[PDB]
Amino acid sequence: PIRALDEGDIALLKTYGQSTYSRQIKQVEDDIQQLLKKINELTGIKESDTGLAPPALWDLAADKQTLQSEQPLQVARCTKIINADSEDPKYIINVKQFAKFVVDLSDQVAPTDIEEGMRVGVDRNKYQIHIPLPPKIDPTVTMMQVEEKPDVTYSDVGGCKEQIEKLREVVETPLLHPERFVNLGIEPPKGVLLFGPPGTGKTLCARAVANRTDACFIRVIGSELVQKYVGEGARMVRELFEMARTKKACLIFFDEIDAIGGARFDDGAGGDNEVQRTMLELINQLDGFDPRGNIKVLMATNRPDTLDPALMRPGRLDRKIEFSLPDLEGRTHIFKIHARSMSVERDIRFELLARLCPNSTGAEIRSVCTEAGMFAIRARRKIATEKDFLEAVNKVIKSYAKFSATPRYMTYN
């Protein structure tokens, strides 16, 4: 028995209570939002100006020479040559996208420098060779040659006095003393994997050897190997393992090789097929016929269990350096690294702080050092006290690691 609407009762509502300023305030807000629009299309000042030089230098070119470089200039294409025959051109030339022609040389060429597999400038009408080219270099390995120093010294990787000692043996020592390996009769390993918990210092050891290398170092973006086209990712592998053979002793660092292939299965007849072709091409240019010589490979992962046993074989990855948690002497050295460059009280002790971080990483220790200064900005201070750090330990660890054991603690004292 509840119904309360009828068109006459609609006219009750919108006249009761501020009949003076109801529409008087509303349409002012309405047409100003219309006026927000009508300013915008009246401006219209987008101005995507690009391509043009400063207009004080090209004046000589675009007087007649630009008109002189329309009709006499050529729109010739570049191609590749298969071979040649004797006494004549008989040149067999492909495009790999267009067809394959058999054409003649032109007048402006020397018939000696028409060697096979050479990029050559080809006419559009009669398709004659005009200009030979320098060979093609791969465009994306140039993008990932680092050419840049990240600034991390070995004095910042504290807590790892022995993991650096294993890593010093493989990378640095044959590149500076290639004598004692031969003068005793051994060979250095050529592949090192890094595995362990996250935030432990995997990237730091890779970032610090890019500082002190004195050699070719190549970061490799992992998901550039995965492409849209079939077989394209496998071709990217090849160009990487050719130019490494040209120069001597270049370093290649992969990172998170969990992504580029971890297991080879087929039960539902399909899946990560194209990823396997790129991943198996990586294997055959790692071991197989034509061993690589002086190419050192570094890999790092967080989930080492799910990797292919084809990569777990030594000869491809030879040293298994793992990272663990620093016991106590490691952590007391880590606090002195991450808190030396901050305004603290000059009398505090750090060994009491290293107690209260039992199962912690180097990332978690630095988060305590940053958070303790944030409490100093909650108050109005410019130096850190002891209780600033003690509240920071409870904020980082104890706010997430335990909630039942701290209040109801009376089983342990």
Binding site: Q18, A53, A62, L67, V275, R303, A363, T370
Partner: protein, 391 residues
Amino acid sequence: PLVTPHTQCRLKLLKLERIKDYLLMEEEFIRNQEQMKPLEEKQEEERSKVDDLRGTPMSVGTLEEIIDDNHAIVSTSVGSEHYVSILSFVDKDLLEPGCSVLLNHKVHAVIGVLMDDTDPLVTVMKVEKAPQETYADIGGLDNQIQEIKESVELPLTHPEYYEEMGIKPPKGVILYGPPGTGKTLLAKAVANQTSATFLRVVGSELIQKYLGDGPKLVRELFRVAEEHAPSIVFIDEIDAIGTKRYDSNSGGEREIQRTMLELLNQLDGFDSRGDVKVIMATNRIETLDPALIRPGRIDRKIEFPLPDEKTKKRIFQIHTSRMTLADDVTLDDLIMAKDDLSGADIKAICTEAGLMALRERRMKVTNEDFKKSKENVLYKKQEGTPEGLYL
């Protein structure tokens, strides 16, 4: 954003008419600006022939290599590569293999160079409007309001405190808790009161099917944020972007899992980061990948619990701002008697009780509206847990 009477007062009639005065004058001044221009030279003969020198159907090409004798090599979309010249007024200082250029059809010649080259999927995620009200809109969360301000607003407004201790501000923030608590509001209030730009990402937004289209959009996402302002990126519902990184039997599962593994790389992997902040939000937190929860990536974990009997008063106060409230009501009737319900519950109670007044032909809202509304909203959550074992 100063409409502060918040009621039908003549001040808001006076204030908005002032805004009408300045925008009409801004219209009429620029209307006079395109009117009284007797300057015509067009381009003093230089760019006018240049605009006729270039072709009218301007096309788009791609550099492969640079042969610097004013005769370079390019590549089309199909891969047809042409020994084209450089037809001037282009400085050879901002053209790199990968930078897209502008070409002709009759001679295919390089006329200009295409700039900014953004794929139109990331420009959709660029917010231009401040949607809602400021921090005074939400009903009291001030312990955790001061947390997010320490990492977003305060380092950008006043970074003089941090150099005195050499401490970089935190980067990543997780918003987690039960649903209906205020996660989406806290991002919108930051996007209202800010100075840098803003980017929103709705969950499964960076997921495609072309096996490399997934991780490629993530690179362009952080590229745009880095090239522009020292700004922040808000990626919401990251429970569909991470679960513990297990290996299994499905092939479409991996292009899911691989895109979500290189977001890890762009965030706190190699090189550096720039001034890019990331704010992430879920309902459940334990089903996430532990590689993302570690510090270095995310330095703040913020709980949003269900409210109390004190700040809940502020929820009822704000959502009953501009409604005709009868003097019979007591706000503490429904608060103290029942002690379970979210902030989004309270907005539904205020709207339902307003519908009950029109349901029985009223403008003012009494206690009997809230008696029926507090029933009707809450009957969507089940009866109970266990019987009286405990005592």
